[PDB]
Amino acid sequence: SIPEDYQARLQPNRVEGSYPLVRMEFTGATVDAPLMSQISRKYNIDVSILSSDLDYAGGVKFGMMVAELFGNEQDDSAAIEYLRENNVKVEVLGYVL
Amino acid sequence: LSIPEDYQARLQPNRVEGSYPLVRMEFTGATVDAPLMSQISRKYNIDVSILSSDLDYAGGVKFGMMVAELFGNEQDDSAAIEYLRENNVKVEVLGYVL
Numbered sequence: 001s002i003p004e005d006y007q008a009r010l011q012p013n014r015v016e017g018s019y020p021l022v023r024m025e026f027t028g029a030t031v032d033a034p035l036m037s038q039i040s041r042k043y044n045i046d047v048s049i050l051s052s053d054l055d056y057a058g059g060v061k062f063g064m065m066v067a068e069l070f071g072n073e074q075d076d077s078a079a080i081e082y083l084r085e086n087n088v089k090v091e092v093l094g095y096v097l
Numbered sequence: 098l099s100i101p102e103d104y105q106a107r108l109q110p111n112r113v114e115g116s117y118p119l120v121r122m123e124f125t126g127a128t129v130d131a132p133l134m135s136q137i138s139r140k141y142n143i144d145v146s147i148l149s150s151d152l153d154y155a156g157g158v159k160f161g162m163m164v165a166e167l168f169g170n171e172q173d174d175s176a177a178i179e180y181l182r183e184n185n186v187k188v189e190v191l192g193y194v195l
């Protein structure tokens with residue numbers, strides 16, 4: 001489920017002037033922390049949230065979020081590995097030009 | 098419009114020591130097109146602890162709701178809430194979580 005105007009602009013590889021579009025999955029294995037806040041501060045990422053379907057039930061926060069990550073290549077790569085280190089599953093769908 | 102049991106039990110009408118606001122934020126096509134959670138995370142040093150979100154993007158518009166606990170100082174969270182409102186996010190302070 002990716003909006004069609006983002007699809008039309010989605011490329012497989014990173015070109016000049018494009019930014020990663022990610023789908024992030026959260027489960028009861030994901031570290032319990034304000035991770036979007038932390039990468040916003042630590043790596044100078046603007047997390048442009050497109051869609052989310054996160055829920056909290058039975059003591060667990062779970063679901064998915066799709067976001068475009070605005071920053072530079074070094075910073076967005078660092079932020080993606082930080083999220084993976086904290087057990088967010090991150091799929092880099094492509095780069096939005 | 099639901100809020101998880103365990104949060105409900107801890108949710109107070111007023112701000113006490115060691116409590117933090119729980120907010121419900123509504124996004125419509127009137128909301129400024131900006132990475133607002135990132136912006137308040139930096140500008141006001143707010144940790145946005147997201148409980149639930151139901152945000153969709155269709156037809157050029159992001160819309161829906163997000164419920165989050167806002168961790169920071171009282172001065173900073175009040176400033177961040179006003180910043181969100183100024184950017185046309187509807188913000189309901191549901192209470193304070195102790």
Ligand SMILES: [Cl-]
Nearest residue numbers: 049132133134
């Ligand atoms: Cl946002």
